[PDB]
Symmetry: C2
Subunit: 154 residues, 2 copies
């Protein structure tokens, strides 16, 4: 394996952001969701310009082989911030070489520069790689997640 470089994507890197989205679709087995309906370049540029969205990418020979998409939540109860990892994936043939760890490490540096005091993330049962990764790097709690449909508003 070659040198792996990581960086945070800016609005000048929409093309790499789309490559990261395509990586999510391949590694999550959901190409339609991540590749067939991507936002336009103005929208992705605006998201990448914002201080409350973070996209990190890992590169191998200038191809995206890992990606992490996170939100920064400025809190309402105190002037503090939390970072919420939404999606994280590493290309299958590049797995188990520390690339996800390097992306989370870069996210930690981003957190410290923002002053965010914690990073957190969710994983499903049966997602053994993600569970093993976040158990190594973090403290694990069992919780419940609920999805609510807005279209049934009354």
């Amino acid at each position: 394996m070659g040198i792996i470089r990581t960086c945070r994507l800016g609005p000048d890197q929409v093309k790499s952001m789309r490559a990261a989205l395509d990586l999510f679709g391949r590694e999550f087995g959901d190409v339609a969701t991540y590749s067939q309906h991507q936002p336009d370049s103005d929208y992705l540029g605006n998201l990448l310009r914002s201080k409350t969205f973070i996209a990190l990418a890992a590169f191998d020979q200038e191809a995206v082989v890992g990606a992490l998409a996170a939100y920064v939540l400025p809190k309402f109860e105190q002037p503090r911030s939390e970072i919420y990892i939404y999606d994280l994936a590493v290309s299958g043939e590049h797995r188990r070489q520390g690339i996800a760890t390097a992306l989370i490490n870069l996210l930690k540096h981003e957190a410290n520069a923002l002053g965010a005091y914690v990073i957190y993330v969710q994983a499903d049962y049966g997602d053994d790689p993600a569970v093993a990764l976040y158990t190594k790097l973090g403290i694990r709690e069992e919780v419940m997640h609920f999805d609510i449909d807005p279209s049934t508003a009354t």
Copy 2:
């Protein structure tokens, strides 16, 4: 019980937002976290002006008796949005009268006006009221939550 009115707070309602924060602190048993270190009025005003933060309040005789604090996440894979309920509380003596349901119903209307396709939320085991509420209004999944400390960046 009197008439209960609900609304979404704007940047002109910082005082009610602080009352909602104080309500969180009392009902969650954590007054220091929610009342002793609140952000300044510029910060709360900026948060309430933003299109990615939602604070809803329920009132009884013009006192805040329920509050819901949520984030709107514009997604990166598609031009769509999700609403993440962060905190939700109803004053203890006002519980079991549908106030939380009315706040979630108002959040559904806010979601439809934004075009957000889903609302979701997390609850802990042993938080029987929240579990019962979100089981009634939503679909429940068991998942794992991981907290990661940025201060151990390497």
